[PDB]
Write a protein that binds this ligand. Structure first.
Ligand SMILES: NS(=O)(=O)c1nccs1
Ligand SMILES: NS(=O)(=O)c1nccs1
Ligand SMILES: [Zn+2]
Length: 258
């Protein structure tokens, strides 16, 4: 047994094993659109996923991760609020049991049906494990999912979920293009924060896109068929795997747009 999202091991318990849960720069947060300062010094985000190499998809018991080859500068995030270059290592999502909840960040208290996280690590620290020990170690791009028209570029991900239903299952997952998960606009808010699962390390520059992607009800339904438990255990549907908003405290949310 370990941390999870249930009544006995969920977000409100995490602090007992990861005391930084109560720290000064925790994620997610509510993005108050009227308090976020437009910052004309922010650069456009640079997302270069042209040469991205997906390798595998994994159910790790808390979400599913699509993993990338990060042994070269093939899929990088640069510009925006960032200095230097961050390599894509994985993406995953957080979603709800119902369309009314599921996102981690909220926007003037609005919850989206899900949220995508494309996780990148600062190439000056050499590997992901070293980056997470650093205040500017990670750059996570957050994208909101709302339910409406399907996202054609998500379908390949939903169709493989049958094969990784339970914890520890993985499947080959090559030639997936993450550029088909982006919305049209790259307007963003940014603030310094943390991993939103344990160990909750305060290593993240969060870059959250203003424009949501639209996904179909059937697509998000297929997320909710996955399982937190392993094969041949009591079936526990993988839903509501989001941490609620944490105290903003001494932080400013900047906007890249007016
Ligand atoms: N702090 S924790 O979420 O890992 C936890 N372990 C057992 C019950 S709650
Ligand atoms: N949910 S997240 O992107 O902040 C993340 N947490 C741990 C590894 S990646
Ligand atoms: Zn996440």
């Amino acid at each position: 047994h370990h941390w999870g999202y249930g009544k006995h091991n969920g977000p409100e318990h995490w602090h007992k094993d990861f005391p930084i849960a109560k720290g000064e720069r925790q994620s997610p947060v509510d993005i108050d659109t009227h308090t976020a300062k437009y910052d004309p010094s922010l650069k456009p985000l640079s997302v270069s996923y042209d040469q991205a190499t997906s390798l595998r998809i994994l159910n790790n018991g808390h979400a599913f991760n699509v993993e990338f080859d990060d042994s070269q500068d093939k899929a990088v995030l640069k510009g925006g609020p960032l200095d230097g270059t961050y390599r894509l290592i994985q993406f995953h999502f957080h979603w709800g049991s119902l369309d009314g909840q599921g996102s981690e960040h909220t926007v003037d208290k609005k919850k989206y049906a899900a949220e995508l996280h494309l996780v990148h690590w600062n190439t000056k620290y050499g590997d992901f494990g070293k980056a997470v020990q650093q205040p500017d170690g990670l750059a996570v791009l957050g994208i909101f999912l709302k339910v409406g028209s399907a996202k054609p570029g998500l379908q390949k991900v939903v169709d493989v979920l049958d094969s990784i239903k339970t914890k520890g299952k993985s499947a080959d997952f090559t030639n997936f293009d993450p550029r088909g998960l982006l919305p049209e606009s790259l307007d963003y808010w940014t603030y310094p924060g943390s991993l939103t699962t344990p160990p909750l390390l305060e290593c993240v520059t969060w870059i959250v896109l203003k424009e949501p992607i639209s996904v179909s009800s059937e697509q998000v339904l297929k997320f909710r068929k996955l399982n937190f438990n392993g094969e041949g255990e009591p079936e526990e549907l993988m839903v509501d795997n989001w941490r609620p908003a944490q105290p903003l405290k001494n932080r400013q949310i900047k906007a890249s747009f007016k």
